[PDB]
Design a protein around this nucleic acid. Structure first.
Ligand SMILES: [Zn+2]
Ligand SMILES: [Zn+2]
Ligand SMILES: [Zn+2]
Ligand SMILES: [Zn+2]
Length: 112
DNA sequence: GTCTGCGCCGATGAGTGC
DNA sequence: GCACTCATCGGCGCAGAC
């Protein structure tokens, strides 16, 4: 609907195209008031700002370890739930971590 | 050299509400 | 139609264990 003049990717609205163009201009409008690091995406600055607060607000319901970000907590909880979301494309094996799945698939390929 | 665990990013998407 | 918030998910880097 809204196409990028520089790489042909397409977007839904003026605002999402405007956001994508920052990948090409390097514009980073949103500046951390503590350390001065700038971000292209306001939501990414907000994650960063949690680091300076030092409040690890996201707590594991299984072992009670605390984390700075919700996403970091959720990745951690996979250890407890047994969620293995990375599937080998060649066999039944399932993996907790993407890097491990990738190395396992490469072993299939080296065998042909 | 690989597996684990995790800290911190870029960039896109879903949901929401105007 | 539109923008905003937060989720999502890959990438990367690293340290400890083996
Ligand atoms: Zn582009
Ligand atoms: Zn900062
Ligand atoms: Zn836990
Ligand atoms: Zn396999």
């Amino acid at each position: 609907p809204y196409a990028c003049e520089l790489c042909a990717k397409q977007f839904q609205s003026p605002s999402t195209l405007k956001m994508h163009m920052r990948c090409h201009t390097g514009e980073k409008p949103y500046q951390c008031k503590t350390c001065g690091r700038c971000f292209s995406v306001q939501g990414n600055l907000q994650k960063h700002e949690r680091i300076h607060l030092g409040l690890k607000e996201f707590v594991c319901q299984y072992c009670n370890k605390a984390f700075t970000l919700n996403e970091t907590l959720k990745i951690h909880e996979r250890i407890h739930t047994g969620e293995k979301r990375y599937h080998c494309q060649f066999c039944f094996q399932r993996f907790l971590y993407l890097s491990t799945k990738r190395n396992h698939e490469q072993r299939h390929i080296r065998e042909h």
